[PDB]
Every structure is written in C-alpha cells, then in structure tokens.
Point group: C2
Chain length 328, copies 2
C-alpha cells in the first residue's frame, strides 16, 4: 500500500517527482564506517550529499531511490541523516550488486530470499528501516550465482509486492535473459525495471521489453566521457555517448506509445570508493548539476523537442509511484 522510506512510510501522493536509480555513496559493506577519511570524513560526505540533494529539491525532486545494496556499502543511517536534513524522501534497497562477499555468495536461493525478506519486512541491520525496492546486478551472461539472486528477488517481490530493479554490467543489454528468469518465477513484468537501458541504442530491444510491461530505466543520462577521451577509467564507466543521445531514447519510447513504461534518473552519487580513487571528481567535472541534471537539463531538452509537459510529469511522477507502490 504505502511506500517505505528511510524516514518511515509515505503515501503515494507524497512521492512526487522521483529519481528512480540513485545512490548517496557507492562503496563496500562496512567501508564507510572503517575508513571514513577515504571520503575526507563522514561529516564532509554528509555535507556534500545534503547540499546536492537540496539542489535537486529546489529543482523539483521530491523522492530518490537509493539502490545501494549491502555489498555496495549501503549505510542506511547515512541515508536517514541525509534524507532528514535535505527533506527529500529516500527509498532504501535490498538485493545483491556485483561485489558480494563470501558470506553472501556462498548462500542458497532460499537463504538469499530470507535475507531480502528480512530487510523488506523487518528492517535493515538494527534500525527498523525497511527496504522499498530490490536491486540486482548481472554481468553479460547471467552467472549461476546471479541466477540465484534473480530468483530470490522474484520470490521476495511476490511475497511483499516490492519492485525489482536490475542492470547488466559490461553489456549494452541483458534484459531478455533477466526477464526469462523473472517470468519463470511468476513475477509480473510490471514489478521489474530493466535499469541502465539507456546504455544501448537498440530501440527494437527496448520496445519489445516495454511492450511486455517491463519498466525501462533510462537512468544514466548525464554519464558521458565525451571530452575525457584521455581518461580510460572515465570512458569505461560513463561511455562515449552524449547525454542528449541517452535522453532521446526517452523521446523514442514516448513516440512508440510506451510513455507509461519509462523511468528516468541520473545514476549519481556523492562519494564512491568501489572504483578508482578520486573518480567522484571526474563525475563532478562532467555533471556539476549532480542529481539536479534530470529536472534542470533533460526535462527542458525534451520540452524543446516537443514532448508535452503532461507526458513528462507522467514519466517523473506517475510512473515511479505506480512502480514503487507495493503490488502483488
């Protein structure tokens, strides 16, 4: 019914303009607590995230989905502190990303299902903060362990109504292999977002998934290493396609009649330790607008290309609310 946030449950009407694929910090389990000075200090990270989220709020953002899992270093007390000080809703996540420690990757599908249910139904750690989404990541061809994760995600979603968001690393696609596993578990496509789908220009691929009822996450819009060709780490992380090319996939799916299947986001963050040192400075140099990039740059761009305001409000308000509202 209602949606669980790091400040507690909110009604669908309170969700508002939502960014569906974000993070406060991209890290590893326990790392922010063990080496906060990697980020300058915990206090500096909080300050930067609060300033950044307040800017996004000024630009109209009301809710973000922090898809950070246990193994991406999710620190729900950090999310709570930042959500409260920025006065922006944050939905927390369960699931498994691409760096599970042994205590996770040795677990069975039944064990993973119980872990996800604990975080959704009881709370994360000892905080009582409950997850409102399940995040899964796969590599190219689904590994045996990643199939266990996808199946446990489907089983937790069916038990709680909470949605699933995915992405594929190092491959421009992946959604068709994921969708096959999800449907083999009886999961409705309307509970699944195929994330980072703006990494490809394969419109046939995107349209076919949308036509099955999947949500299409065009959610890395500002990521572009154009101009940073001499930084190989930036190219591998952000790609060589312009943000306008990513944004025009939004227009293309609208033009095909699938406005209701689109979710949009920046895939931003305010600190990152899981990649090369000081990569946050590289991303900040490419997109000083941070999480405000979507409302400030992409929305007017799509308006200039003729998309009605009503259609954009449906994509940024109505679709995420339908997605996040628990449904089974």
């Amino acid at each position: 019914d209602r949606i669980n946030t790091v400040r507690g449950p909110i009604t669908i009407s309170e969700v508002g303009f939502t960014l569906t694929h974000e993070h406060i910090c991209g890290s590893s389990a326990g790392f922010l607590r063990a080496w906060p000075e990697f980020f300058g200090s915990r206090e500096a990270l909080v300050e930067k995230a609060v300033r950044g989220l307040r800017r996004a709020r000024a630009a109209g953002v009301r809710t973000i989905v922090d898809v950070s899992t246990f193994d991406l270093g999710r620190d729900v007390r950090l999310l709570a502190e930042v959500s409260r000080a920025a006065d922006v809703h944050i939905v927390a996540a369960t699931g498994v990303w691409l760096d599970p420690p042994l205590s996770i990757r040795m677990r069975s599908v039944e064990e993973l299902t119980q872990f996800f249910l604990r975080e959704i139904q009881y709370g994360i750690e000892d905080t009582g903060i409950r997850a409102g989404i399940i995040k899964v990541a796969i590599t190219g061809k689904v590994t045996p362990f990643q199939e266990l994760v996808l199946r446990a995600a489907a089983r937790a979603s069916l038990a709680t109504g909470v949605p699933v968001i995915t992405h594929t690393a190092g491959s421009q696609r992946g959604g068709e292999q994921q969708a096959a596993i999800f449907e083999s578990e009886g999961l409705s496509p309307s509970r699944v977002c195929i994330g980072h789908s703006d990494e490809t220009d394969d419109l046939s691929y995107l349209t076919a998934l949308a036509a099955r009822g999947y949500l299409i996450g065009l959610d890395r819009i500002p990521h572009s290493a154009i101009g940073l060709e001499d930084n190989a780490s930036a190219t591998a992380f952000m790609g060589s396609r312009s943000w306008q090319t990513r944004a025009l996939l939004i227009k293309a799916l609208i033009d095909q009649g699938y406005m209701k299947q689109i979710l949009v986001s920046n895939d931003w963050l305010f600190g990152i330790s899981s990649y090369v040192t000081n990569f946050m400075d590289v991303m900040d140099s490419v997109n000083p607008d941070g999480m405000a990039f979507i409302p400030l740059r992409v929305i007017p761009f799509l308006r200039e290309k003729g998309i009605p305001q009503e259609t954009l409000a449906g994509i940024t308000v109505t679709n995420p609310a339908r997605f996040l509202s628990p449904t089974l």
Copy 2:
C-alpha cells in the same frame, strides 16, 4: 611497548599464555550487523564465544589474538563484549584476508598503508580500539594485489612496531614468497610469523625460515580432520633443531563462520569439541609426554607471544 587489546593497553606481564592465531567469528564486513540471524542471533554468538573463551581460560589461556581483518568481518565491539565477559584479553587485527571488497582491492600500496595505520594508530571504526597485529593472507602464487598488501603491511609494521602474521592458502609452502617481499621492504624477520606452517611436513623448509629469524606459526593443529599428533610433532622437531624461541602455537578456531558453507561451524565443532582449548588440553600434554620440559612449553606459549606482540620498531 605495551600491547593494545580490545579493552585497552596491557603490560607484557599481563599477556600470559597466548593463542596467537584465533577468531571469534569468520565472516564478511558488515555481515554480522546485517544478518545476525544467520548465527541464530548476535546474543547466541556472544554466549557461545564467552563459554568457549571461559573454557580456554580455565585451561590456562589468558590472551588470544583475533587475526580477523576488515574483510573477514571483524566486529571489534563483539570482541570487546566477549573479552570482558570471559576475562580473556583479545588483540585485534588490521590487514587484508582473501575476500577484499572493491573498496579495498582497488587501492594502491600507499592507500593500504594509510588504512592499516589508521587501524593501528587511531582506532578501528569509531571505537578507539587499536589493532595490535597485521594479518595478510595470500594464495599459492602471490598476486599483484597481494604483493601490494604485503608491502603495505611491512610499511605499517615499520612505522608502528606491530608484528605481521601471514599464511598461504592452497600450498603447503609459500613462506619464501612473503619473506622475499618483506625483506625487500626492510622488515625484520623477527616481526613476522609465517602461519599455517603445520600444513607442511617439509621440516627443512621450516628450519630454514626459522634460521633466518622468522617465527613459525604452527597454528592449525586441530584442523587435521594426517593426524594432529603428526602436526604437533613438528613443534618437537623445531625445538630439537634449536628454534624453540621461533615457535608460535594456536588452534585457528572460531565460534561462528559465514564465509563458507552453511553449518560448517557444526562440522568444525564435531571434529574438535575442545575448541580453543585444544592446544592446552591436548597438544601441551602430548608434548610433555614426549619429553618436552615445562620451561620450554612455557617459553613457547608465554615468552614467545609476548616478544612477538610487544611493539618493537628496531630488531636486535
């Protein structure tokens, strides 16, 4: 020169009989906090650890070294609670084991040095508990990343005087690889224990390391599950070569484990019900029956660990 424990600094005279390579829990960073029910509950893990440490204390143990690193799920607040309840000193560790997350394995040698120094000089997380040892694990062939870890460990040891303990996973030898890297950095062998050394029968290899000044960690004795007596006889063999001062003995035990198959703890407990008391209850009497004097046993279990753990920036 005092030794840092999870309850603060203690003097050498308080260290007593020490188990130099142990764990309370073998896990992953953040896992005990995120899924305590995997262990039944946090309270159940505490109660089991306290009973196990009280049993070891009644067999004479006064200090354990918990060599669990960040990536093995070290929870220093758990260690502190168990140490207080059982009245057994616990020395905590920094370093890197075999499962570093991206935030660790993307780091440079200079960054890893700073991380170890933070945990030794300032404290672990926000607790003020300082590490008293650096643990490094490697695999058969040292990987490029493992070499960075070994060099960072040497640099942190040289800056603080705390010792380093290492082992090689998947090869009965391998100490030569670490020794060459450590010496290239200027680290004294007297600051280094080559652990899991009871996993080889090649006594010539252990003797050659002992002759270079390394400490020999005969610390997986009950993991035979090869008999434990044959492993324990390596202790007598090294004594008879004249290297009693270079021997450290332990169990490499723990009271919960999540980093392998589910219920592996039950397998472990079935083969060694003595837990951490295996060394004092089985190995020490066995060596005494084989004619090792009391004074030599006390040297190995009291004098050697205190010499090893006492921060020493300059070797004799």
